[PDB]
């Protein structure tokens, strides 16, 4: 919503870009999935939203993949009393 807002609201640009309410959701979804194509934000306001979203994606996806390794490599747990 913020990416759409900062990219279309200003009337002193008119459609200056393809970042509508439907292409902003697609762009954000692709970025989070670590995919992406078609279009990238070209305005200063749009780039800021993309930059933080890219930063947000990098931590979350990396944390998921790194933590998933531990779940796949769960060591056999034993009760306190073992003899």
């Amino acid at each position: 919503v913020v990416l759409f807002l900062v990219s279309r609201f200003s009337p002193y640009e008119w459609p200056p870009n393809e970042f509508g309410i439907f292409n902003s959701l697609w762009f954000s979804l692709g970025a989070f999935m670590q995919q992406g194509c078609d279009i990238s934000p070209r305005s200063l306001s749009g780039r800021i939203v993309g930059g933080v979203w890219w930063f947000f994606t990098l931590i979350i996806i990396s944390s998921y993949t790194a933590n998933l390794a531990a779940f796949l490599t769960v060591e056999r747990m034993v009760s306190p009393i073992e003899s």
Partner: protein, 182 residues
């Protein structure tokens, strides 16, 4: 207009849902004192000897040391500034939409409303994160109630309304260009 009507209805639903969530007490279901249906401000009692007794939650409990980063998280939590700030911004958005009808010449009051609803949604995200983070700093099962989801639902409504206000601002500014084309 049809688009205007859905904006008016959406604004009143988001404001009502957010207002209810702040005033209700069924945000969380956890075990403690007073099963307890803990709220945003006061926790109460469930199945047990006491079933209606409520007590104002002690958001600064003494058990140690108060880390300066931990002292500011509990200050924002205790004061619920962001959930309250979500209600205020939604209220302002409603006034801006109503003011637009009376004038219908400015065109910059429909944009102002859009900013408030988007800003209101961003505040609700912080309130949700702050509320969850504070609870996670306490102790082996819990489940959120309808009050928590009313705030989450209000965020979706608010963002949808914010989009409509922007689209109305865009549409109204498109008509002017057409009129100024001849």
């Amino acid at each position: 207009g049809v688009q205007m009507l859905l904006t008016i209805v959406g604004a009143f639903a988001a404001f009502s849902l957010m207002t209810i969530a702040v005033g209700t007490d069924y945000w969380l279901y956890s075990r403690g004192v007073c099963m307890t249906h803990s709220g945003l401000w006061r926790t109460c009692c469930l199945e047990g000897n006491f079933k209606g007794l409520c007590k104002q939650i002690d958001h600064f409990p003494e058990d140690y040391e108060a880390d300066t980063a931990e002292y500011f998280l509990r200050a924002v939590r205790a004061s619920s500034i962001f959930p309250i700030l979500s209600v205020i911004l939604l209220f302002m958005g409603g006034l801006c939409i109503a003011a637009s009808e009376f004038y219908k010449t400015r065109h910059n009051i429909i944009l102002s409303a859009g900013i408030f609803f988007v800003s209101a949604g961003l505040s609700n995200i912080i309130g949700i994160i702050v509320y969850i983070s504070a609870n996670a700093g306490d102790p082996n099962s819990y489940s959120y109630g309808w009050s928590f989801y009313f705030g989450a639902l209000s965020f979706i409504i608010a963002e949808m309304v914010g989009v409509l206000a922007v689209h109305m601002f865009i549409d109204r500014h498109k008509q002017l260009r057409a009129t100024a084309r001849a």
